[PDB]
Amino acid sequence: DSCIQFTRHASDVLLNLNRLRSRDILTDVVIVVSREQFRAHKTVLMACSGLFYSIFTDQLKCNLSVINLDPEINPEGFCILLDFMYTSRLNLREGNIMAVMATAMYLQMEHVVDTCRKFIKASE
Amino acid sequence: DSCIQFTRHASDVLLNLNRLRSRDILTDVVIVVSREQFRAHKTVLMACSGLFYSIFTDQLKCNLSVINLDPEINPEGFCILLDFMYTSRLNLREGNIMAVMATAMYLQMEHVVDTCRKFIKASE
């Protein structure tokens, strides 16, 4: 086509989606990770995770307001990944890399799994 | 912080949100523009438009499944802007620039209004 493109549009959209998350506006699901609860937008979760994409395209699960994750999932790893989904920034540290990679594999977040594997290979 | 960032994350999220729109997945509102209907995600509309942000943060309007736009709004101008919201690409042409600018002013999409004003100033 003969379209023009606004370079910062996608980044500005995600920034606004994160502002809605911070003010708890139009969040439509709670993700339960052991004793912790995380409110989010189903669409953003689906856009970032192969697992949430499969869950919310299921004719029964699409209507659930609460999703319980596997008990092996670490709440801090999930929190770090939820922040990444809404900001593109990953808080990857020596102390959390194993939990983050395990959570990203479960959530099916291929690019996160890739950088975790590379950061681990560098430290061996 | 000491975060790393995935450059393409925001673009990939928006691409996935557009795929959900194309398959009509988790769309939660219909925007009526005269005889035409456009299905969309309330969160994406709010993230792109000052008008939709104000509408869906209203305690009564946040719960509406149908929003009727002013009858002066052109359905083609709206369609072009809805595509822009979900893709960052604006199909701006000599034949549609006036309708697109009028619609962007109504929707409160400042960057679109700015490029329309510049393209119009160049042709005078």
């Binding site: 379209c3 023009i4 493109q5 606004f6 370079t7 | 690409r89 604006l90 960057h111 490029t115």
Partner: peptide
């Protein structure tokens, strides 16, 4: 704005 750019030509994509």
């Amino acid at each position: 704005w750019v030509i994509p």
